[PDB]
Amino acid sequence: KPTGFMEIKREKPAERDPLTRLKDWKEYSAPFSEEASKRQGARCMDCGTPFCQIGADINGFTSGCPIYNLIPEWNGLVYRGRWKEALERLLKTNNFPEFTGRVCPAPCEGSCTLAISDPAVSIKNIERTIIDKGFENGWIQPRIPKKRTGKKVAIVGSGPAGLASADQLNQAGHSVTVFERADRAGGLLTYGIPNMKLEKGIVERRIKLLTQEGIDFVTNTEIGVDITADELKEQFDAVILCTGAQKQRDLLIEGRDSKGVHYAMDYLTLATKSYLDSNFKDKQFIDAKGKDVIVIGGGDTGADCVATALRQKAKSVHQFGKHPKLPPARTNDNMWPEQPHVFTLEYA
Amino acid sequence: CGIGLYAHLKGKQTHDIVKQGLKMLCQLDHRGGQGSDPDTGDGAGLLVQIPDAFFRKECKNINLPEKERYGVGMVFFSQKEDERKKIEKQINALIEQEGQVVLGWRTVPVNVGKIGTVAQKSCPFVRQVFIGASSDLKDNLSFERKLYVIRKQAENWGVTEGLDFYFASLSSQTIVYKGLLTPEQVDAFYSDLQDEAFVSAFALVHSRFSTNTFPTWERAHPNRYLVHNGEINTLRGNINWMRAREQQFVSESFGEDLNKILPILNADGSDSSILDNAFEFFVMAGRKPAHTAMMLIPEPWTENTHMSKEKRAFYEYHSSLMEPWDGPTAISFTDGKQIGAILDRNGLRPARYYVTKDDYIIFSSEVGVIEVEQENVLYKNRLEPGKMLLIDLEEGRIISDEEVKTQIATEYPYQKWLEEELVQVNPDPESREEEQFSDLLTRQKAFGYTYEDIQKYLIPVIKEGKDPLGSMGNDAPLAVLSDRAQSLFNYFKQLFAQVTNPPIDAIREQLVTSTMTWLGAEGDLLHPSERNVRRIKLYTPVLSNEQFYALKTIVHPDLKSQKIDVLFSEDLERGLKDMFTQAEKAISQGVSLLILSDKKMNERLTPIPPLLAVSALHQHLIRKGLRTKVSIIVESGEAREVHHFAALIGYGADAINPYLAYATYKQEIDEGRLDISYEEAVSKYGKSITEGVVKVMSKMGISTVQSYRGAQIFEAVGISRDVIDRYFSGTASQLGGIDLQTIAEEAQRRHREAYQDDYSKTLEPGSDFQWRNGGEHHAFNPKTIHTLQWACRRNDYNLFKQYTKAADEERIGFLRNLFAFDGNRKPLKLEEVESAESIVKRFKTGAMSFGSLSKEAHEALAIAMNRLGGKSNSGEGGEDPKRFVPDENGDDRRSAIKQIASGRFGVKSHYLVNADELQIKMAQGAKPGEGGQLPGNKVYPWVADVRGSTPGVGLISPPPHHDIYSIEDLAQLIHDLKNANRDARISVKLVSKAGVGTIAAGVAKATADVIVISGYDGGTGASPKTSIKHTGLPWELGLAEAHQTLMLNGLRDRVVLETDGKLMTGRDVVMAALLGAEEFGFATAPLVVLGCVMMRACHLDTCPVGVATQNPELRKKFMGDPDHIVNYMLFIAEEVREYMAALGFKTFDEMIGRTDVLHVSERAKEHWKASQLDLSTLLYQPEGVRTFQSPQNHKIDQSLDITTILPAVQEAIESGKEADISIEINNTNRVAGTITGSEISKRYGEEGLPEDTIKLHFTGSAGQSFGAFVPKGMTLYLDGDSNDYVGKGLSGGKIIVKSSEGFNSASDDNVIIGNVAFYGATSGEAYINGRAGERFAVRNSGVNVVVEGIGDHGCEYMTGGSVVVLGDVGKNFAAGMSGGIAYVLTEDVKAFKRKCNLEMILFESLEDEKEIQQIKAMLERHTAYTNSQKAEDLLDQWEDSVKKFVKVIPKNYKQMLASIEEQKAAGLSDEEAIMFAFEANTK
C-alpha cells in the first residue's frame, strides 16, 4: 500500500551555496544519496495510465517525456533498491541519460498525475542519480555489436540527434561517419549549453564511448564548399541531415550597427571554446568584467547569457522580455495536463 | 413450476389418488407466469402405473395377459396418415423380428377444443401400442430390457429416416401423459383420466416453466421414468464423455444389443431428456435405481469430515469411473415398484413432504399443495441434502436412507480395493535439478511475456497468497480487432450463470468443492472391478517440475508415457493430422498418458496454440472413441494466468506444467528479488493457481473439477463457424471471424519477431492492465481524458467535438465502431427534431457503491442527475435515510434507482418504499459470478453505520442471490418487490452472453418491466484481474440477440431494454439506440468529468484525486462540481440531436430498431482480419413491433392483502390505533403482509408504530416469502406451516410460527419453515416452533430468532443480531459468520465442534449475567407466545441448561465489542470511541 505521495514531502539534493557558485566552473548540483533517492522514488504511486509518458504536443506546449521513458517502472525499481535493473530499463529507451538528466527541463515533472495541487516527483533527479551511480560503478561498457553488414550512412551534424542516430545505426550494424565543423563533437552540448549545466568531461566521455563503438568521427568538415553533395551521395548510400538550426533572427531596428552588439550563440561558443582551450587565458573571447551587460530575448538563451556575464563578473546585468511576468500559480486558462506557466526561479 | 407425487405406501389403489394428483397440479399451476395468453400450456404431465382394469374394460379387442407379462407404449404422431401407417408397419416389423408378439393398437380419445390456440395448432396424434411377452422372457427385467431395445431401435430408424415422432414411454409399469397443457386442461384433454376405472399406487406429476415461448410436445416432461427440476450446467462435457464411453461399453446382459443401442442419448434433447436416457441405460444395464442414482448424483465426498469411511470409499471409487452431474436439481424417479428422491450436492431446491395415518406420502415443492387433516399428519420432514428418500411399494415402508446407503456401500470391499490397487509415484528426492534454458528472454518473448505481466501478476500472487485485484475493468479492444499480435487465449471469454441456477461460492462452501483428478484409462463401467481404480489420482490440476518428471519417468507397463511434439512448419492441418497419427499409433501400442510438449522449439518449428491443439486432440479422441483409454497432459510455456489454466482444463488438458513460469521464478530468485525459497515459491504458485481455478469454477457453478474438465464453458468471440465445428464443436460463436490460416500467420509473426529480437535484452512493457505509450490502444487514453475534462470544465463545444472525434476515429475500439451510416437520406434541420430536454430524460448514472466512492462524489452525481431530470442510482451499500429530504438550497440527493444486490445491506421498508424504481443486481460487467470482500481496514464506521454492520468487521457479500435458485424464484422476487412498492418499476441487470436472448425471454415471462444488458467493458470497485479481462462479451451482441429473441417471441412490446458500458459518445448512444436501446447508463464518464484520471487504483483505497477513497485527507482534495456533469450530459444530448438531424429521424420510437440504416465501414474490410466477420446476425430485422406500449400488467389485484386486510386497516394505520383481524390463507396467496408494511412505512417512516399495534392472525399453510419487509410494530401470528423465504428483508416486528392445532407429535422436531429464512433482515424478533431449512438466517443483521434445530449452512453470513438454537445443527454451521452471536444448544460438545466450521468462530460458555438474563427473557417470551414443551422444559431445568448452552462469536466481533465497551467505560463519546477502537484494531 504505497502512501509516499502524502506521507513524504518533496526535497532537493545538496547544491553548492550560491555565494560560492560564482567562482568555480563546475556542476552546481549533485545527485541524491541512497536513502534520499529511495524516499523520493517511493512517492510515485505505481500510477496507472501515467501522464508523465504521453509525450505529445498539447496546446502548443510539450507535456510528458517525449522519448517514452519507463518512468513508473524505474521509479518503482529505485524505491525497491535494485539499481542495475533500473539502469537497464532506462537504457532500453533512452540513449543519452547523462545529458537528459542534467539538461532536460523535465516536462514530466510539470505534467503528471501527482502534480494535482501537490509538488511533483523528481523524475529528472532520479534519472540523474541512476545514471551517475551507474557510471561511477562502471556498469556501462561498450556494446560492440558482433553483427555487421557493409554499409554507409554518413550522418551529418554532431548534435544530440546525430549522436543518437549514429549509435542506433551502429547497433544495427551499419558503418557511419559524423561530419562536424567544430573541433569537438557534440554540437550544442559542447559549446551552446554552458559548462555549468553540462561539464564537458561527461560529453567527452560519451563521445569516447561512441568512438570505441566505432562511430569514427571526422572533425573540421563543413560539408559545404569543402565536400560536394553529389560526391557525398555517390560515396554514401543515405545521409541523415541533422544539419542543426543555428540561424538566429535579427532585429531590423536602426542603431544595430555599432560595435558591441553581439550574438548570444557566438559569444557562448567563444567563451566555452576559450575555457576548454586554455581556461580563458587565450584572450580571444569577449570580455565584460568592467562593463554593463544587457540581454534581449527571454528564455534558456537569456538565462545562459546572464549566467556567463555573471561569471565574467559584469558590474550590472538586466534581462529584458516582452512577455508579461508569469503568475505564481496555476491560472484559469492553464491546467495540469498542459505544461504549467508558473514562476520558476531556476539557476542564474 | 415444480414436481409432486401422491403415493400410497402399502400399494392399495384407487382413483382418489389420481384425482388428488390432478388437484395438486392445479394448485402448483400458480407458480408459473404468463406467456402470449394465459390459456397456453407451458408444459405439464402426469405419470401412473399401468391401469389393467381400465384397459380390459375399454379396449375389448386385446387378450391382455397377466399384470407383469406385457407392456404399454405411448407414441406421438403428426397429423398426417401416410407416415403414420408407415411407422406403424415398421414398428410391428421391429417387434416381430425381435420376437415379441404385438397384441394390437389403440387410439386415445382427446378433447382438442379444451386447449389453447398454439397447442391446438401443434396438437399431435396419440396411439397406444400393446406389446406381448414370449415364454423365454422369464424375468420382467429381461422384458424391460427387450422393450428398451425395441424403443431405441425404433428411435434410431426414425432419426435415420428424418421423420418426426417420439416415444413418450414404453414400459410394463409406467405410462406417461404430457403436453402443452395447463393442469385444468389436462383432465379435459385426456378424457381417459375422467373414467372411474383407473387404479394406481402412485401418481407423479410435474409442471414446466418453458423459459422460451416456443416449446414442443416432446420436450415437456415427466420424461420416460423421472421428473426433473432446474438445469444442468454440465451438459456438453457430459454428452462428450458419454459419447466417448459409448464406443467402449461392453456387458453380457445386453449381449450384442449394444450395436443396436449405439446412440444411447438424444443429442438434440434437453437436459431432462438426456438425463432420463442416461439413467435408463444405466439401470437397464443391471444396476439398482438407487445405486445408479447415487452414482450419478454423489454427495460431497472430498473435503467433508462428517462422512463414514464406507461412504467415502464408495464415492472415491465411483468418482474414479463416472463424473458427477452438478447443478440445481431435485430428482424423483421410479421403476414401477420402487421410488426415490434426491437433491443435488448443494441442495439448491426446496422439498417438503408429509406423512399420514393412512400412508399417503405427499412429496411436493411447497407445503400447502393439498388439504390434509392436521389430526392425521404424522411427519413433516424435509429431504435434506445427501439423504435418500426411498420408497418400496411391495414392502410398504419408507426404507431409511442410512441403511440403504450402508448396505450399498458394504455390498463390495471398496475400502480394500482403494487401499490396495492405488498406484504410488513417490518422486526421488535426490533427482532434483533446477532446470534452466539459457534462453529465458527469447522463450518469454516468443510466448508473449511482458515485464508488466510479471511484476503485476506473478510476484503479487506469492506476496498476497491470492490472485491480484483491480478496478476500472478492461476497455481495450478485442483480440480480433487489435492490430497487435495476440495469442489464441484472448479470443475465448469465460461464461457464468445468470438465471435458472446460482453461482455457487467456494471459500465459504469449501465442503462442496472437489479438486480430485484421475489420470490413466478407465475400465469396464458396466462390470467394474479394481482396474477402474488402478489409476493415478491428483489433488490439483497443476503440477511441479519434480511431479511432471516423476509422471514421465513412471515405467509401469499398464501406465505408459508418450511424448508428442506439438509443433508445425507451414501447414497447421498437416501438423494436426501428424499429431493425430502419433496419438493413434501410441494408443494402438497401448499407452495411457500423452505429453504435449512445446520444448525443443527452434526458428524453423513454431508451436501450435496450445488451446487449439488440445481441443483438436480431445475432439478427435472423442470421435474415434479412445479418449477413455488415454490421459492428455499438457506442457506449454504460455500458461501463467488462471484464465489460460481454466481454458486448458475445460477443453481437455489433464495437467499443466508451467515450466516457463518456474524458470522465470528461478531467474528472479537467482537475481535477488522474491527472497522466498524456490520450493516454497513453486508450492505457493501451485496453490494460488488451484484457488483461481476453483474461483473460475465457482463463477459458473460447476463445483467439481472433474465435471468442469469435460464441460466446455467458453464462448469464442471471433472464430469462424467452420473452425468451431471442426475443432471446438459445441462452443458458441456469433460473428464467425478469423480462420486457421490467419491464426497460423499470427503465430508465425510472433515467433519470427521473438526469435529475431537482435537489438535489446529486455521485455517490452505490457499494456493489458495499464496504458503505456506505443502499447495496446485503450478506450480512455490521456488525450481523450484531458480533452473531455477541459471541454466539460470550459463548457466549450469545439473541444468536446474534438474529444468525440479522437475517441471514435483513428482506431478500432469496439464492434460498434465498425458500423457506418449510408449517408444518402433526407437531413432535417436541428430545429425540427426532438429537444435536448427530451433527450436527457433517458439517461442513468449506473450503480455506484457508496463504499467504493466518497460521499462528496456520490452526492455530486446524485445532485447533478436529479437536477438534469434523469434517474440517479444508489449502489449496494444502501443509503443514509437523511438524503430523502431536499435541502433548503433545493438540492435533492435522493436516488431514483435503488439497487437490490446479493448483500441486501440497506434493504428496509423505508429504503424500498421511498424510491422510484428497483433493480436486481443479478450480475455486473466485471465480476458477474463473484461476490466481494470489504475487510476491516477498508470498512470505516461512517460506512458500517450506513450498511447496518459493526465498525471494523470484514463484510462478505455472497456471490449468488440466495433467494434466486431459478427463474421461478426470480419471478417470485419480482412479485415481492412490486408488492413492496406498487408505485415503482422493476428492473433486472444482465450481462451479454450466449443464450441471453432465451434468458431475456424468460425474464419477460417472469414479468420484469425493464431489462438492462451491461457489457463486460463496464467498471467495478474491485474484482480479480482475470475476471476483469476475460469475462463477459461486448454489449452489442447481447443487445442484438436479446432484441431479436424478444421480438420474435412477441414480448418485445412488454419490456424496455437498456444499455451501458463505455458509452462515451453520441455515436455510441445512436448505435445502442439503433441496436434497440431505450435508456442508457453513464458511470465511467461522469467520474472522469468529476476528476478521475483512470488511475485504476480504487481497490487500493488511495485515490489521489479523492474520488474513490474514504480517507478524509484525500477527500479534502476533491474538486468536482455538478455543473460539469450537467454540461457533459447537455453536450452528449446536443451531439445526438445533431446526428438525428443528419439521419432524418423524427422521434425516438420511430428510429428505434431501424437497423437497416447500418452498413459495414470500408475500414473493417481494410483491416487484415476484421474483414472476415459476419455481421448479418446484428443486421437483421424480423417483422414486429419495436417499442414499449403495454403496461406490463402485474397481478397486484386480487391479492389477499388488498381484498381483506387493508380495507379494515386503513383506519388503524391512519389513526395509529390498535386493530385485530383473523384471516384464512392458502398457498396461492404469496406474500400476505408486505403491502400493509409498505403502507405503514410510507405513512410514518423508520420509527414505525408502538409495539404490537397491528396483530394479524393467520391459519393454514402460508405462501412463499410470507411476511416479507414487515416493519416494526406489526405482528404476524401464523398458526401453521410456511414456505421458503419467511420474513424476507425483515425490518422489525414479531413473527410467531406454531404448528397446527391438530398436530400432537414433536412439532419441535418436525420442520416448519423452508430453506431460507430472514435473508438480509436488519432488526426484529422471531419464534419458530420447529426445525428450519437449509441456509437458515443467511444474512441476519440484527434479528433475534429462536428455532428448534436448523438445516445445513445455517447462519452463513450473519453480521449481527443473535440466534438461539434449541436443538441439533447441520454441518458447516456459521460458514463465514463475521459477526453476531449464536447461542447454540447442544449435548455432544465434540460432535458440535466437528460439525461447526472452525475458520472464523470462537466458542465459549455462558458466564455473563446479562447474557444469561437476555437468553432467559427470550425463552420466557418464546414460551409465552408458543407454549413449546422444549422451551418449558428448558426453563424448568435452567440450572442444567445454563451449563449445557454453548456460545459462538467471531474473533473480530468479540475484540471490537471489548474495545468499544472499554472506551465507553472510560467515558468517551460514542463517535470518538468508535473511531479510536477502529484505529487501534486496524492500525
Ligand SMILES: Cc1cc2nc3c(=O)[nH]c(=O)nc-3n(C[C@H](O)[C@H](O)[C@H](O)COP(=O)(O)OP(=O)(O)OC[C@H]3O[C@@H](n4cnc5c(N)ncnc54)[C@H](O)[C@@H]3O)c2cc1C
Ligand atoms: C535545457 C536546455 C537548454 C538549451 N539551451 C540552449 C542554448 O543556450 N542555446 C541554443 O542554441 N539551444 C539551446 N537549447 C536547444 C538545444 O540545444 C537544441 O535544440 C538541440 O540540442 C540541437 O539539436 P541538433 O541535433 O540539431 O544539434 P546541433 O548542434 O544543432 O547539430 C548541428 C551540428 O552540425 C554543425 N553544423 C552546422 N552547420 C552545418 C552544416 N552545414 N553541415 C554540417 N554540420 C553543420 C553544428 O555546428 C552542430 O555541431 C537548449 C535546450 C534545452 C533542453
Ligand SMILES: Cc1cc2nc3c(=O)[nH]c(=O)nc-3n(C[C@H](O)[C@H](O)[C@H](O)COP(=O)(O)O)c2cc1C
Ligand atoms: C467504480 C465503479 C464501481 C461500480 N460499482 C458497481 C456496483 O457496485 N454494482 C453494479 O452493479 N455495477 C457497478 N459498476 C458498473 C456500473 O454501475 C454500470 O453497470 C456500468 O458498468 C457502467 O458502464 P460505463 O463504464 O460505460 O459507465 C461500477 C462501475 C464503476 C466504474
Ligand code: SF4
Ligand atoms: S527529465 Fe528525463 S524523464 Fe523527464 S521529460 Fe526529460 S528526459 Fe524525459
Ligand code: SF4
Ligand atoms: S510522475 Fe505522475 S503520472 Fe508518472 S508515475 Fe508518477 S504519479 Fe503517475
Ligand code: F3S
Ligand atoms: S481509477 Fe479510482 S483510484 Fe481514483 S483516480 Fe480514478 S477513482
